[PDB]
Design an enzyme around this catalytic site. Structure first.
Site, PDB file in Angstrom:
ATOM      1  N   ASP A   1       0.859  -1.173   0.000  1.00 18.46           N
ATOM      2  CA  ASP A   1       0.000   0.000   0.000  1.00 18.46           C
ATOM      3  C   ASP A   1       0.901   1.229   0.000  1.00 18.46           C
ATOM      4  O   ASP A   1       1.718   1.398   0.910  1.00 18.46           O
ATOM      5  CB  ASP A   1      -0.938  -0.009   1.210  1.00 18.46           C
ATOM      6  CG  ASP A   1      -2.062   1.014   1.094  1.00 18.46           C
ATOM      7  OD1 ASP A   1      -1.762   2.202   0.851  1.00 18.46           O
ATOM      8  OD2 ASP A   1      -3.244   0.634   1.218  1.00 18.46           O
TER       9      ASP A   1
ATOM     10  N   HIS B   1     -15.972   2.350   4.301  1.00 16.91           N
ATOM     11  CA  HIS B   1     -14.607   2.847   4.089  1.00 16.91           C
ATOM     12  C   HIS B   1     -13.953   2.299   2.820  1.00 16.91           C
ATOM     13  O   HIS B   1     -12.722   2.272   2.727  1.00 16.91           O
ATOM     14  CB  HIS B   1     -13.717   2.548   5.310  1.00 16.91           C
ATOM     15  CG  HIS B   1     -12.527   3.444   5.454  1.00 16.91           C
ATOM     16  ND1 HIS B   1     -11.402   3.327   4.664  1.00 16.91           N
ATOM     17  CD2 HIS B   1     -12.273   4.451   6.326  1.00 16.91           C
ATOM     18  CE1 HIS B   1     -10.510   4.232   5.034  1.00 16.91           C
ATOM     19  NE2 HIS B   1     -11.012   4.922   6.044  1.00 16.91           N
TER      20      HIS B   1
ATOM     21  N   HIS C   1     -10.360  -5.615  -2.441  1.00 16.45           N
ATOM     22  CA  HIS C   1      -8.986  -5.687  -1.965  1.00 16.45           C
ATOM     23  C   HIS C   1      -8.992  -5.969  -0.473  1.00 16.45           C
ATOM     24  O   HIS C   1      -9.773  -5.373   0.275  1.00 16.45           O
ATOM     25  CB  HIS C   1      -8.177  -4.406  -2.254  1.00 16.45           C
ATOM     26  CG  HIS C   1      -8.840  -3.134  -1.819  1.00 16.45           C
ATOM     27  ND1 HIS C   1     -10.026  -2.684  -2.361  1.00 16.45           N
ATOM     28  CD2 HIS C   1      -8.453  -2.191  -0.924  1.00 16.45           C
ATOM     29  CE1 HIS C   1     -10.355  -1.532  -1.797  1.00 16.45           C
ATOM     30  NE2 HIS C   1      -9.416  -1.210  -0.924  1.00 16.45           N
TER      31      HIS C   1
END
Ligand SMILES: [Zn+2]
Ligand SMILES: [Zn+2]
EC number: 3.-.-.-
Lengths: 143, 144
Positions: free
Chosen positions: B29, B95, B102
């Site tokens: 990330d 969110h 993912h």
């Protein structure tokens, strides 16, 4: 002593939902949302890395089937009601029962369901690059 | 085609690649909330968990497990010390920003970083649980 193993063995009652040759699911009796479900492998292991692969492959298909059961699957848009899938590993990560369990938590509004604290840091390619190099080295030796 | 995660899989947008599988793709990330915040995605494009074929779902958690070995998280077999969270989000209110499924593998080294879990207990009852349980069982019988 594990209470989830006792749920599986029928020694503590549970509001059972989908049960598989490998997987067991039931209503959370301390929910944080209306149809809060737990999904556990029948193989007792405290953390995710303690679960064999053949048990791990079975969990998300069961979770996805539960979303049909809860009708969460009728909303194919990013808006409206949603849901979270969460699994915790260790006290500091909010795990209390030391047997792997995935939470399927409907998100109907902001007061209920999961509340996500998201302390994101800026992109720094130098630190990511060094981290990627180190992780690819550990990957090479896992193989 | 307009999906950053599809483009990342095809290599049209850069990424820090980790483990890849016939069915699964994982990478760092680049706006991490903890040090080795990893993303794990099915190659099949679905927006939510229920849009993903069973055979892609079956491969995800074994990849996440293998990633805990890469990150050395598998070395702590006690409930104390540092931990980690697996999170998957469905819909904006939950969110989710990118509409390709993912999974987050998020190390939990302290309280300031990593996932923060808000956990609002909801007053409930064995009557309410029981009637809810009967309603979901009826629906399960139809799904079968
Ligand atoms: Zn157990
Ligand atoms: Zn996509």
């Amino acid at each position: 002593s594990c209470i989830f193993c006792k749920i599986i063995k029928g020694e503590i009652p549970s509001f059972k939902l989908i049960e598989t040759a490998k997987t067991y699911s039931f209503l959370d009796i301390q929910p944080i949302a209306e149809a809060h479900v737990l999904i556990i492998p029948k193989h007792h292991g405290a953390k995710l890395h303690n679960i064999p692969d053949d048990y791990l492959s079975d969990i998300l298909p069961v979770v996805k089937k539960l979303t049909k059961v809860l009708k969460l699957d009728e909303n194919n848009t990013p808006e409206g009601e949603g849901y979270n899938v969460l699994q915790n590993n260790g006290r500091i990560a909010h795990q209390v029962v030391d047997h792997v369990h995935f939470h399927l938590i409907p998100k109907k509004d902001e007061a209920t369901g999961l509340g996500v604290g998201w302390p994101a840091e800026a992109t720094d390619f130098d630190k990511l690059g060094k981290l990627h190099e180190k992780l690819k080295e550990e990957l090479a030796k896992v193989d």
